[PDB]
Amino acid sequence: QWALEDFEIGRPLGKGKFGNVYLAREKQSKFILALKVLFKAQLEKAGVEHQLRREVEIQSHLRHPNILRLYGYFHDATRVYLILEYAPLGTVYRELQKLSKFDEQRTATYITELANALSYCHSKRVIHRDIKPENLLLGSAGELKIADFGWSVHAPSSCGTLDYLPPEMIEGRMHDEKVDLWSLGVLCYEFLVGKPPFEANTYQETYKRISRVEFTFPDFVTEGARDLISRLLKHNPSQRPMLREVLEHPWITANSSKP
Ligand SMILES: Nc1ncnc2c1ncn2[C@@H]1O[C@H](COP(=O)(O)OP(=O)(O)OP(=O)(O)O)[C@@H](O)[C@H]1O
Ligand SMILES: O=C(O)c1cc(-c2cccc(Br)c2)nc2c(F)cccc12
Structure with a gap:
């Protein structure tokens, strides 16, 4: 219920261990968010889906002003994407x-x-x-x-x-x-x-x-x-x-x- 073609990608935000975070915008709503991209190849060659699925479960259920919202997830050929709340002050x-x-x-x-x-x-x-x-x-x-x-x-x-x-x-x-x-x-x-x-x-x-x-x-x-x-x-x-x-x-x- 999500796809890469729903997002207008922008500037890199930071670099992760398995991939970069990019500033992005949901085309239909004009919503500013951060897309954390992870490469399926690298997470495999490490064996951490494990946690990636744990991260997503844990994070989607937490609601607090001092915790970063996770709005969702979706994936393609070799990439796994997480839709996060964008933190504008780094x-x-x-x-x-x-x-x-x-x-x-x-x-x-x-x-x-x-x-x-x-x-x-x-x-x-x-x-x-x-x-x-x-x-x-x-x-x-x-x-x-x-x-x-x-x-x-x-x-x-x-x-x-x-x-x-x-x-x-x-x-x-x-x-x-x-x-x-x-x-x-x-x-x-x-x-x-x-x-x-x-x-x-x-x-x-x-x-x-x-x-x-x-x-x-x-x-x-x-x-x-x-x-x-x-x-x-x-x-x-x-x-x-x-x-x-x-x-x-x-x-x-x-x-x-x-x-
Ligand atoms: N929502 C966001 N807004 C702005 N910057 C972000 C956001 N999420 C991540 N970043 C930046 O991108 C970098 C990667 O973030 P994150 O720690 O989530 O990736 P990671 O370290 O690979 O996670 P993991 O510990 O699961 O491997 C961080 O240094 C952070 O500064
Ligand atoms: O075998 C795969 O296609 C694969 C799927 C996923 C995945 C699917 C739904 C939600 C989430 Br979070 C992840 N992740 C993979 C991965 F991290 C590494 C290798 C294959 C997959």
């Missing part, structure tokens, strides 16, 4: 490259929007597992929008850089919704410092650093922030807080700018 990844690092206000606000969207996901027993600045998009009012549900799955459960992954995931162990709170602390740190707390020149060093929880705050990180990052970056996934605790944290409530 990624949190590009904004951090421009600004180098974010102020406590911008960070707390993004951490608030993340927690909201995450509560919603966890309330449907859905774990994102791929929370990275390359997957955090910005809508026309600068609001965060969680995207890329390729690696998401239902809680509990058992490719790229290891930076945002909790020790239980890197160690192949069993994992639940607490995985998304480790990511939230890695993001909070990265937003303030400009780099993730466990970055290394090798996948190998990063693994040691994550498993040991080897992180140090530079001087400009306030006690308020130090507290929450240390609270979320706990090796024991039971020792991590709930999103309700995050949303109510003094540093969060004090610096977050509510709507």
Whole structure:
């Protein structure tokens, strides 16, 4: 109930792992959307339909102002197309490259929007597992929008850089919704410092650093922030807080700018 000839394709938006996202317009409605294209050949040669069908199921059923809408799907000869909500202000990844690092206000606000969207996901027993600045998009009012549900799955459960992954995931162990709170602390740190707390020149060093929880705050990180990052970056996934605790944290409530 969809076809490529219903869309007027435009400019590339970003590059994915299995194909590019293009700015596009539905001819009949003049609707602006993003078309994520994936090549059947590459997903095959990797064996990830798997997730692609999981991404589509999970994403089409989520309705939240801080989660990216998936309007549909369709396919052809060698391509698989996803019709997504277009995020006009790009990624949190590009904004951090421009600004180098974010102020406590911008960070707390993004951490608030993340927690909201995450509560919603966890309330449907859905774990994102791929929370990275390359997957955090910005809508026309600068609001965060969680995207890329390729690696998401239902809680509990058992490719790229290891930076945002909790020790239980890197160690192949069993994992639940607490995985998304480790990511939230890695993001909070990265937003303030400009780099993730466990970055290394090798996948190998990063693994040691994550498993040991080897992180140090530079001087400009306030006690308020130090507290929450240390609270979320706990090796024991039971020792991590709930999103309700995050949303109510003094540093969060004090610096977050509510709507
Ligand atoms: N709706 C959108 N609006 C604007 N830019 C987008 C949109 N969707 C994706 N992008 C850009 O395109 C790139 C690819 O996005 P995405 O993460 O969905 O692909 P991917 O990483 O291949 O997903 P997966 O993790 O399932 O492989 C991102 O860097 C993002 O900046
Ligand atoms: O064997 C195929 O034709 C094939 C189909 C699809 C597909 C169909 C409907 C919805 C979605 Br999401 C995907 N995907 C493929 C793929 F990812 C790789 C190789 C073949 C297919």
